[PDB]
Design a binder for this molecule. Structure first.
Ligand SMILES: [Cl-]
Ligand SMILES: [Cl-]
Ligand SMILES: [Cl-]
Ligand SMILES: [Cl-]
Ligand SMILES: [Cl-]
Ligand SMILES: [Cl-]
Lengths: 351, 351
């Protein structure tokens, strides 16, 4: 009651606590109080709980067996604020998602089935579907292997992840304005939602090249003020209402690729620069690369073929996105690599 | 083998992983590799393990039943470096120590004995003894209660802690120079070890008042260069050898008390300012307050009586130290309040 079984995992480049739904209070307010206490929030240092004093390590997954047709488990993502008594069920960023498949198997929501085991995951926050393929050699999840992702030392078991029903996850449409491009504060942008609502505009159009490192971007007050005025201006158009204290849309500043990739991106999510790029924001940006004349179309190098592999270059490397594009040109699925690791398993306590 | 039972606790204003000795490899090199992997080191973000990406949350306690006369458990403290593949068994700072008593009781090294339970702890790093009194109402440790310590939100069960055999823990003598005061780079200082080797000098003597906040102190390059030249100059005198890449001695800049206390301290440990003060450094400073004409004697207000309560004021509050002083004037024991909390219990995993 003042404890719950819990597995602490790294999912992608994030970390947090993974629960079975039936182990947390049914009452939302009771649930949030418990998770705040588990993390040690509110406290800039989160010294009296399991948060790592950074929003990326103050995250929670709630997983349960699904009754939806074709779905194996339902997954609710929760952000536990570091220094506010606030838990939000914001848009999925796609990193904590990576631990969901392995966690479900370990907890018996899904039994191991051969040496690899498919987990079909409904993302309750947005209504999207992720199919994760996880290594279960011998009938037990493994986290060891040869996969790498930027921002994570060494190598782990690959978890290839295929996203469906991304389109208009949050905005109700791929293009909530109905336009490929909209002029906003005199600038051409794309308002797009293929898994994450994004505003996609050229880095050069807001006075940077798009190749600056994260620290310089975080210190560029005039850049931040400029794109933030754009974000606040488009919230209604994107069916997002007043975005002032919202986490969306992500601001995606695109420049031509430099390392032979598809596109270069600097992401503000919305107010600080992402060290890499969010998974679902990569899908939105890779999709915008395909819409003609659009800011991202103008900078991107897009390969021919129905199965398009788009290497999205970011501050510290690149994240590769495989778009499967039907003969009508819409994106039918996006596949991206994740990794995760079980770090501690047992019981968490609150006062 | 690639896991161990482990309890994650907050101890004082630090956090880390608590093990039974018999659950870790006997081989030191094997042990260090395992603990590095457990924390997610080396990695500035410690994203692939249980470290909180700060040295204060990248700490380990190793506890076992003691055979020493009068000792209940042996405790070895280990610092797991955040971004280096290095584990050190440095001097005890006294915060992780606070979880040792409760952990021993929970693991059955010591059985609960009534509603409060004494744990006599040998600190293997330095040879000191700490007696911790822990609440065991009903025969089970509790972490709830009305105690507070600066740097930890809310309140917890008190763990009153009494230190003995502090004198010359590391230096072999209370005063390794044999002098109450030594002139170093033209400045009077006290080289003292009553639980933590410290250099004690007046804040004013190095060009600050001693009331500056931590951020200003951390940014004072000329202050840091000045006291660091002092530290490097005294390492041999204190029987510490070449202190260049050492963590000791702590630099303690004392000023007259301002909130009715005994003394005001700003601590460099050795290169960044402490947010409060270390427990054992408080004992060393409180002891130096009693040695006549000495820098700390000149600034301190010392109360009459054989049981002296010295409120050591620090950046974010004060830490109170009860010295029990025998008729010969030496310190016979120092008592200080700690708190701890069990945060997660179960098993930790490495690849
Ligand atoms: Cl459940
Ligand atoms: Cl936060
Ligand atoms: Cl997610
Ligand atoms: Cl043991
Ligand atoms: Cl470190
Ligand atoms: Cl300690």
């Amino acid at each position: 009651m003042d404890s719950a079984p819990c597995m602490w995992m790294r999912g992608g480049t994030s970390k947090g606590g993974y629960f079975l739904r039936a182990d947390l209070p049914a009452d939302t307010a009771a649930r949030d109080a418990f998770l705040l206490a588990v993390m040690g929030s509110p406290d800039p240092r989160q010294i009296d709980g399991m948060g790592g004093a950074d929003p990326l390590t103050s995250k929670v997954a709630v997983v349960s067996k699904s009754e939806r047709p074709g779905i194996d488990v339902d997954y609710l993502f929760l952000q536990v604020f570091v220094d506010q008594a606030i838990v939000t069920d914001a848009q999925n960023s796609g990193n904590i998602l990576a631990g969901v498949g392995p966690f479900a198997i370990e907890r018996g929501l899904v039994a191991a089935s051969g040496d690899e085991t498919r987990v079909a995951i409904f993302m309750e926050n947005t209504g999207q579907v992720a199919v994760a393929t996880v290594r279960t050699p011998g009938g037990s999840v493994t986290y060891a292997g040869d996969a790498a992702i930027d921002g994570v030392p060494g190598t782990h078991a690959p978890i290839p992840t295929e996203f469906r029903d991304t389109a208009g996850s949050s905005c109700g449409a791929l293009l909530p304005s109905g336009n490929a491009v909209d002029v906003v504060n005199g600038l051409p942008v794309t308002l797009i939602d293929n898994g994450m609502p994004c505003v996609v505009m050229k880095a050069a159009d807001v006075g940077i090249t798009g190749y600056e490192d994260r620290d310089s971007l975080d210190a560029n007050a005039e850049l931040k003020a400029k794109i933030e005025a754009i974000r606040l201006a488009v919230g209604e158009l994107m069916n997002l209402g007043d975005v002032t204290e919202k986490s969306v849309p992500k601001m995606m500043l695109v420049a031509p690729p430099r390392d032979g990739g598809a596109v270069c991106v600097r992401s503000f999510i919305p107010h600080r620069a992402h060290a890499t790029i969010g998974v679902l924001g990569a899908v939105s940006v890779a999709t915008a690369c395909l819409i003609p004349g659009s800011p991202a179309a103008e900078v991107a190098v897009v390969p021919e073929g129905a199965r398009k592999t788009l290497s999205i270059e970011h501050p510290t490397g690149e994240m590769s996105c495989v778009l499967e594009v039907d003969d009508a040109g819409n994106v039918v699925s996006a596949a991206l690599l994740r990794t995760a690791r079980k770090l501690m398993d047992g019981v968490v306590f609150v006062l």
